[PDB]
């Protein structure tokens, strides 16, 4: 949760990720030549849970 200035006041913002966009980025970069980072650090049980 973060705070964003809206005019003269503040707004509370709750951030949610994007699973489908993450998967699409993963495959599109898999078939590409951009530098990229793999970032393999998630266990199988954590991914299941």
């Amino acid at each position: 949760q973060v705070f964003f200035p809206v005019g003269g006041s503040y707004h509370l913002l709750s951030i949610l990720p994007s699973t489908v966009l993450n998967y699409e980025v993963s495959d599109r970069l898999y078939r590409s030549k951009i530098p990229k980072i793999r970032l393999r650090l998630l266990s199988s049980n954590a991914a299941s849970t």
């Binding site: 949760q1 707004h11 509370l12 951030i15 949610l16 994007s18 980072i37 650090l41």
Partner: protein, 255 residues
């Protein structure tokens, strides 16, 4: 009500949050704008009564917490997790979430509005600056704080400027294909999160950090950016990031 420029020179930040949804590396500009707004709030709590207009970022040094592979790619590191609250508090070893950390040597250019802006403001900003974090990273040291007006007294470095035109005129059916094609044909642009979407209706929710503000969910939106040297800059107002709120938009823009 005079308007000048204040330069925080050569600030070293370590363990800054370098992760996004699909971005690893440079932190979001919203973090730097939030740091500027927190500095403004801390100053206005001290009866200084000034406000910040635009923020300009100048990268000098960077390092990714990890190591380069033999082939050439980066592999990142992470601290050993402690005791995650919730279930399995008493467990000796906790789970590992996706994270990344970066090391930066960066300079900040700030535009201020308020009465009698002078060296007393510099002393106050020096006193109050060593109490906050930049994108979650602790400030280790800093060169100095200077009061400048023109572009001549600017140290060598590279500014991050929003370039959405190259993203717009790229070839591709959808936005992601346009982005990857623009990054394929041009090897200098980098992708940075710039703001937040809405995808939700405002109101009041249970469990928020402060249960008085208006609450709305968001999602970080991503655009392109580039680097250029200090002497190549035309006007000092071109490299000044600023907020931009709209109906369902919470973005930051270079305009």
């Amino acid at each position: 009500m005079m308007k000048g420029y204040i330069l925080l020179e050569k600030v070293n930040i370590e363990n800054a949050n370098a992760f996004n949804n699909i971005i690893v590396g440079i932190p979001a500009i919203t973090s730097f704008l939030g740091f500027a707004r927190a500095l403004e709030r801390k100053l206005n709590a001290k009866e200084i009564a000034i406000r910040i207009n635009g923020v300009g970022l100048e990268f000098h040094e960077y390092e990714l917490k990890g190591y380069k592979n033999k082939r050439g790619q980066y592999v990142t590191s992470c601290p050993l997790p402690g005791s995650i609250p919730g279930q399995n508090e008493k467990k000796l070893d906790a789970h590992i979430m996706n994270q990344a950390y970066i090391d930066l040597n960066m300079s900040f250019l700030l535009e201020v509005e308020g009465p009698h802006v002078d060296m007393s403001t510099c002393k106050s900003i020096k006193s109050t600056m060593e109490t906050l974090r930049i994108a979650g990273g602790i400030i280790r040291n800093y060169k100095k704080i200077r009061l400048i007006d023109t572009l001549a007294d600017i140290p060598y470095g590279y500014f991050l400027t929003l370039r959405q035109d190259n993203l717009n005129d790229a070839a591709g059916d959808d936005m992601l294909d346009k982005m990857i094609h623009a990054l394929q044909q041009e090897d200098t642009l980098v992708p940075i999160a710039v703001g937040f979407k809405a995808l939700s209706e405002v109101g009041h929710v249970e469990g928020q950090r402060d249960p008085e503000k208006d609450h709305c969910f968001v999602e970080s939106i991503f655009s392109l950016g580039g680097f250029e040297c200090s002497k190549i800059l035309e006007d000092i107002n071109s490299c000044l990031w600023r907020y931009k709120t709209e109906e369902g938009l919470y973005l930051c823009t270079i305009i």
